[PDB]
């Protein structure tokens, strides 16, 4: 019952007061420092896997043109409404729709003039939210390949906005009108082994090929080329050193007519959600020379590569994640109702994404005790940020709160405290205490 | 200059390789990690001034309702007239951007686009009523961040325990339909903002005066006196006063030139209606003049006020058994606004005198001389030369060095002079070389930005080398 309980801090209707829009939520302040340890540790992993990936920063407006190479003004459809964002720049949209409500068949042709006029100038000036981050990487290609000295591999990554007009958006994060995404797009030379299957060879991993076959599977044993190989390698432990457990993480290869056209290769990464089963939080795309051949044609502008008296196309290997998704599923599958006196709900988020990772109780709401957990408090900010500081209710209804959020550890000061100057710690998990020196708190 | 400066990697005119819309940015490599050094700083900063303070990350489309009760829709608007003919009436151009949720759009829109003095009558019923349905379901790209704090105040309250002071802060983007966009960064269509809205009780005294009453700043009152005060001094009540004074701080730590920043006092005729205390953080840009990077905003109760009328939601507070809505003190930033101070500000021609051949001669060279600890880019890794040795070294000491910091460049094309060149442009504070004598005896060379003085130091120690 993810509904309920993501309303605890995690995320909420967008503009909740109101009537929210479907397919778009805020999220609170637990759902955004949880997205930002994902998106944290997601940049940290991909864009060290080599020295010239690199994270940009591109607008989320694009021009019209950018999505007749990309194909989505004449595909993006669904049954045929096409799901892009139009974004009117200029005063002539609203001079036309001014025009449109105040329309009677009685007028002159001067006002139907008028009409025509402006949405002439406002079609010309129209441009798009972008449905994608992709887009950004391969346009922004030309300048930043000779930026890093013309070598390849080069890696652009975006972790941003975009923006789909969904008919039925639905469950919570999964379908959403705006998201976040993360793409690694990797512009390659096909000819030559850039990437070091040995590193990744022994990987083993749930695979499930395109013929339906659910096979346990080592990277080297892959039916795909070495180089999208080794990257289904590193993918699978991203996921591993998140925390997602082994049996409800796999790989889909998806058949030639299941897979977006100009994926040569389309593997879903696939989290089985404990509230709506398995769903892909993301893929691995190998697009050939595809992407720059099409923005080459369409743009008029260079995009080839020189080696060896000889030009090409890059080609490129995308690695896409959603972020909303990604979250989603850290809640989903560590959200645990737990049985040993009562029932509790407890978060049981791995320790490095917690969105808060420390409590500091004082046991009674004596001013003894409070004046001993406020010095605690003040110790361990600079160690951790941020910590939940209460004294207020029972010892353990202030327990059972931070379970439910997910808090690692609790640090309760009692008179014991007072006297040798040791804390208890409890432990999110086992639910077992340790006494420890407030000096011996960091470790 | 600095329009050819930013295109080494800090931003370029957005889709650059098509017909980019003026307005619009994409930030290269470098651009991108000095933005995100900045919005850490400014986190790290804000977010711990006090303890019930927190980000939220709002959706960027807010409904039509919420731009009602803030006034967005009647009032946020540019004067607009429309060579060498007449000028017509001056009139008043709403900035804000809709966006069309559904399929409502496009129908009502391929009337409108394949419109024409030809159409039946039956056409034209038909798009006044598809216009209609349209404009019933749109929605709008919020040109600021604050409403989302504001709208999502009812329920974080109850969450925090009903505590006041609540801070929430928001990082991310708005949008404007402008005119005119003009010099880079500083009037943009697409833009990042950092916000911090602060909820509390005025008459409640939770920010102690103490901590920043004799700091110093530059200060322009409304009426134009120029002068250098104490937060103490400043025309405030307390509570006001005191953010003047941890904002001076946070520029401060930043490495803003004294000189270079000052708080002006907006006028009655010249602030929003309803700040009721508007004060603009200006930066001296070299380039540009005085311009603003930020605001202080005093609102009152206006905020929560509109909200709770327009939605019919309680946003009250229940103090001492009296309900009271909470006021808002807003500091509001211009992110990229700031990234462009941090370009500007310390791009530098420098001219200066260095020993060479046994005596001292003239030079002169482009540094970026950005404060080190937001250099987007800390260390650079240079192989003397293109020879298998040093460049198995280099790689070995790149491989260390990046547990240190991150990102690294690395980079062996051309002379050593020319790569010092390179990242001297970029700002990046230390260069690393490995020689020859590196082979022997395990050493390197230590090229520092600002001195432009070379250190041996064994591979071992390197990680001690000073960020500031």
């Given at each position: 019952d993810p509904k309920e309980y993501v309303l605890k801090g995690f995320f909420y209707p967008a503009?909740?007061?109101?009537?929210?829009?479907?397919?778009?939520?805020?999220?609170?302040?637990?759902?955004?420092?949880?997205?930002?340890?994902?998106?944290?540790?997601?940049?940290?992993?991909?864009?060290?896997?080599?020295?010239?990936?690199?994270?940009?920063?591109?607008?989320?407006?694009?021009?019209?043109?950018?999505?007749?190479?990309?194909?989505?003004?004449?595909?993006?459809?669904?049954?045929?409404?096409?799901?892009?964002?139009?974004?009117?720049?200029?005063?002539?949209?609203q001079e036309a729709l001014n025009?449109?409500?105040?329309?009677?068949?009685?007028?002159?042709?001067?006002?139907?003039?008028?009409i025509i006029e402006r949405v002439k100038k406002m079609v010309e000036n129209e441009a798009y939210l972008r449905p994608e981050t992709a887009q950004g990487p391969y346009v922004?290609?030309?300048?930043?390949?000779?930026?890093?000295?013309?070598?390849?591999?080069?890696?652009?990554?975006?972790?941003?906005?975009?923006?789909?007009?969904?008919?039925?958006?639905?469950?919570?994060?999964?379908?959403?009108?705006?998201?976040?995404?993360?793409?690694?797009?990797?512009?390659?030379?096909?000819?030559?082994?850039?990437?070091?299957?040995?590193?990744?060879?022994?990987?083993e991993l749930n695979f499930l090929d395109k013929e339906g076959n659910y096979k346990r599977i080592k990277v080297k044993d892959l039916p795909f080329p070495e180089f999208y190989a080794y990257f289904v390698g590193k993918v699978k432990q991203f996921y591993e050193r998140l925390g997602?457990?082994?049996?409800?993480?796999?790989?889909?290869?998806?058949?030639?007519?299941?897979?977006?056209?100009?994926?040569?290769?389309?593997?879903?990464?696939?989290?089985?959600?404990?509230?709506?089963?398995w769903k892909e939080v993301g893929g691995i795309h190998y697009r050939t020379d595809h992407d720059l051949s099409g923005h080459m044609k369409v743009s008029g502008k260079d995009l080839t590569v020189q080696k060896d008296n000889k030009k090409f196309i890059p080609h490129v290997l995308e690695l896409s994640f959603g972020v909303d998704r990604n979250v989603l599923a850290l809640i989903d599958l560590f959200l645990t109702e737990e049985e040993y006196k009562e029932k509790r709900v407890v978060l049981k988020i791995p320790k490095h994404l917690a969105p808060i990772k420390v409590a500091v109780f004082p046991l009674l709401k004596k001013p003894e005790l409070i004046e001993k957990a406020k010095e605690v408090y003040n110790m361990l900010k600079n160690y951790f940020y941020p910590i939940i500081y209460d004294e207020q209710g029972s010892i353990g209804r202030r327990y059972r709160r931070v379970d439910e959020i997910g808090v690692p550890y609790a640090i309760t000061i009692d008179y014991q405290t007072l006297e040798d100057n040791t804390v208890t710690i409890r432990d999110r998990d086992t639910m077992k205490q340790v006494r420890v020196k407030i000096e011996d708190l960091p470790n």
């Amino acid at each position: 019952d993810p509904k309920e309980y993501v309303l605890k801090g995690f995320f909420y209707p967008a503009s909740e007061i109101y009537n929210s829009i479907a397919g778009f939520y805020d999220y609170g302040y637990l759902g955004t420092l949880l997205k930002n340890n994902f998106i944290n540790e997601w940049k940290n992993y991909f864009l060290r896997l080599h020295p010239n990936f690199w994270e940009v920063d591109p607008a989320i407006v694009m021009p019209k043109e950018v999505f007749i190479a990309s194909g989505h003004l004449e595909n993006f459809n669904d049954p045929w409404f096409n799901l892009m964002f139009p974004i009117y720049i200029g005063p002539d949209s609203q001079e036309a729709l001014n025009l449109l409500k105040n329309l009677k068949e009685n007028v002159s042709e001067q006002y139907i003039k008028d009409i025509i006029e402006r949405v002439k100038k406002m079609v010309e000036n129209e441009a798009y939210l972008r449905p994608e981050t992709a887009q950004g990487p391969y346009v922004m290609f030309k300048r930043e390949f000779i930026l890093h000295r013309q070598k390849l591999p080069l890696g652009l990554a975006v972790v941003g906005k975009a923006f789909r007009n969904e008919i039925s958006p639905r469950q919570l994060l999964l379908r959403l009108r705006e998201f976040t995404q993360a793409e690694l797009q990797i512009f390659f030379d096909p000819e030559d082994n850039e990437f070091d299957i040995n590193e990744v060879k022994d990987v083993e991993l749930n695979f499930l090929d395109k013929e339906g076959n659910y096979k346990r599977i080592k990277v080297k044993d892959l039916p795909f080329p070495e180089f999208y190989a080794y990257f289904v390698g590193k993918v699978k432990q991203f996921y591993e050193r998140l925390g997602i457990p082994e049996e409800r993480l796999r790989f889909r290869e998806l058949s030639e007519k299941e897979k977006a056209f100009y994926n040569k290769y389309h593997v879903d990464i696939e989290i089985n959600f404990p509230t709506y089963g398995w769903k892909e939080v993301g893929g691995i795309h190998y697009r050939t020379d595809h992407d720059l051949s099409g923005h080459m044609k369409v743009s008029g502008k260079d995009l080839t590569v020189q080696k060896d008296n000889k030009k090409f196309i890059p080609h490129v290997l995308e690695l896409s994640f959603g972020v909303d998704r990604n979250v989603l599923a850290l809640i989903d599958l560590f959200l645990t109702e737990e049985e040993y006196k009562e029932k509790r709900v407890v978060l049981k988020i791995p320790k490095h994404l917690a969105p808060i990772k420390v409590a500091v109780f004082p046991l009674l709401k004596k001013p003894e005790l409070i004046e001993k957990a406020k010095e605690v408090y003040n110790m361990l900010k600079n160690y951790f940020y941020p910590i939940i500081y209460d004294e207020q209710g029972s010892i353990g209804r202030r327990y059972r709160r931070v379970d439910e959020i997910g808090v690692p550890y609790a640090i309760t000061i009692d008179y014991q405290t007072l006297e040798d100057n040791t804390v208890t710690i409890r432990d999110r998990d086992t639910m077992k205490q340790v006494r420890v020196k407030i000096e011996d708190l960091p470790n």
